[PDB]
């Protein structure tokens with residue numbers, strides 16, 4: 493189904509700061525909002541790209557949809573099974589395959605296609621036991637991207653109506669990340685309602701709707717075209733760099749943040 497948030501606002505409630513960690517008790521006392529006057533309308537099959545200054549409420553907006561945070565004000569509609577893929581890539585003890593199809597019914601196909609799209613083929617081929625290689629909790633010897641991709645694969649493979657993808661593209665193997673973005677998010681999932689948190693411009697360009705957060709507020713919402721005209725200062729500064737999307741995730745974020753401060 494689609495997802496809608498009409499003038500939503502949420503506040504810090506004890507525990508949510510404890511949940512996220514997977515001073516808070518001051519924010520809770522003061523009663524400051526984590527998100528404020530959040531507005532969005534996504535149609536089934538559309539892909540929403542979320543971005544913004546670091547620590548602006550992106551991961552939180554997600555927890556909201558997940559129902560781990562409630563909307564003190566405003567309406568929030570969406571339905572069906574939702575699949576979440578956190579910034580923290582978690583690996584459970586078992587095989588690469590086991591990690592991906594765990595708790596869900598198997599489908600030779602569906603599986604092969606996800607594994608392919610997520611670019612896991614280039615990985616499991618380096619292993620003597622392919623996707624049958626046994627991992628130890630946390631997949632410690634694996635690389636950041638390898639875990640991220642395995643983590644994504646697991647999320648994508650699940651059958652759901654809404655897919656919440658929190659910053660999966662933030663590692664050094666940037667080229668692979670670009671391939672994954674296309675074949676998985678843009679192609680393979682093209683007809684699935686999906687929200688993607690990111691710091692890569694290209695992801696905005698190719699999104700149906702954009703959403704830029706900053707200091708818990710909505711700095712912008714709307715298509716990419718609307719973005720260029722209604723936020724010329726921002727859009728100009730960001731399209732300035734030739735190869736921004738290949739800057740470290742840290743560098744990308746530090747710019748978005750600084751830029752967002754200048755044109756608040």
Ligand SMILES: Nc1ncnc2c1ncn2[C@@H]1O[C@H](COP(=O)(O)OP(=O)(O)OP(=O)(O)O)[C@@H](O)[C@H]1O
Pocket residue numbers: 512519524525526527545546547548549550551552553707708
């Ligand atoms: N109203 C507020 N007053 C003071 N600090 C806040 C407020 N709202 C958020 N913050 C700070 O900014 C953070 C934003 O939370 P959240 O992680 O949901 O946003 P985010 O953009 O996903 O952050 P990150 O991108 O680093 O994961 C809060 O955890 C807290 O550190």
Ligand SMILES: [Cl-]
Pocket residue numbers: 632633634635
């Ligand atoms: Cl390692």
Ligand SMILES: [Cl-]
Pocket residue numbers: 632633634635636
């Ligand atoms: Cl690692």
Ligand SMILES: [Mg+2]
Pocket residue numbers: 550551552579658659
């Ligand atoms: Mg986050």
